[PDB]
Symmetry: D2
Subunit: 114 residues, 4 copies
Amino acid sequence: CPLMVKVLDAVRGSPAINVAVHVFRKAADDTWEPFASGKTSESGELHGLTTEEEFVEGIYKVEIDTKSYWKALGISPFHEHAEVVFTANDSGPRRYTIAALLSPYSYSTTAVVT
Amino acid sequence: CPLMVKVLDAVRGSPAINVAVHVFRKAADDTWEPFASGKTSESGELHGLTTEEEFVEGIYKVEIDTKSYWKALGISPFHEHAEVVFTANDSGPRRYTIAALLSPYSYSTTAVVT
Amino acid sequence: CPLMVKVLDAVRGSPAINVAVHVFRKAADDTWEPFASGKTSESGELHGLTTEEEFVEGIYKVEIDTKSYWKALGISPFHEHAEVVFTANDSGPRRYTIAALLSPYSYSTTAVVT
Amino acid sequence: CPLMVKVLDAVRGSPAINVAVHVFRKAADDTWEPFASGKTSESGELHGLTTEEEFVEGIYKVEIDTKSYWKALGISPFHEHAEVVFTANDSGPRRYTIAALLSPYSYSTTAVVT
Ligand SMILES: O=C(O)c1ccccc1Nc1cccc(C(F)(F)F)c1
Ligand SMILES: O=C(O)c1ccccc1Nc1cccc(C(F)(F)F)c1
């Protein structure tokens, strides 16, 4: 899997478990087409969203449903969700780890590309 | 002004000057309508995007053109841009400061609501 | 004032008010000598820690009492406190803003130097 | 190993490899006694610093030599190093992952405790 998402909880000091993640790919008409989706595991990870065959060059949007996550904790979050938009494989296939660190009013995101 | 954006550069240790910021508001048909735009000042700040009369409850998207910013520095960035999506004034008018700290492969964003 | 500290709360989406901040300077014998201290205001800011006459080149440590801050909110924090260690004015006097964004198990810190 | 350190590079979008890490434990006389040290691997990770037998309750300081790391990249960093100070095993043995995300003028740190 060339696309992995990892999500952490900065309030509890633990992985953000069962966070919904939706991935979209920009279509020719500049629309976001659904690409893959999943929920993070107990380790706050989501693997197996794609295959390198299917993961072609393009602009992808990784949307993390942070709102639902905090609501389930009884916390009222600021953001509707966290989005990470990036061009991928523009120079051939690469492995992308998109990480997010969550707090009710803040998130940090980083990408490790190899 | 009930909405202010501040953008900092984590690589140079300075405000991110002249970063284009586009603000949209979700329309009834679930589309993003253009709302306000501008460029950050020499202090990395963007004020006067709205008025509290015009700033009604709704879901707003603040889009920060980070890609152009790094390209201008000769650095190749990961993200197409940074987006902050949030519901505003759902409980009456508030002052929102949306801050972003930028790095080529990472960004952190926080909201200070008062 | 050539040294300012700003502290924000990522859980409440507000400035971190009344956070104790202690600044030290490395002495010849490699010990931390007390330099300045204070508490953040209602805006999460702490100014007037020094004067540019007194603020000479050296290694300074800004210590932020985050533990007390979270305890006062009834939250159990991970860190004893946050420390920022940096060499200052090594190239003549500059204005330093040290900012920190706090969460129970995490903190981000940036410097804006001008 | 109950203590793991992971360090990432926000400028290159990769793990921060070969970063020196020194861990200290607060002694009875309130002095920092050397506890363990190592360098991060190609994956930006440092494991095997201790054993759960040796990792007793106490206040520990994890110091990350960020300055040397950036200097080797020809970048001049703001911080001397990044320090993470925390009380550990105060409620019995736990596994601690201390993560840091680095930029020349900024770092973020989080702890995942299990
Ligand atoms: O901790 C992981 O295992 C991790 C994995 C991939 C990328 C980043 C990772 N950690 C981390 C540590 C601090 C801050 C952030 C960020 F906010 F950028 F997502 C991520
Ligand atoms: O530094 C400011 O003046 C600031 C203003 C409003 C909100 C946050 C601010 N500072 C700050 C300091 C560290 C990290 C971040 C964040 F990444 F969240 F944007 C923001």
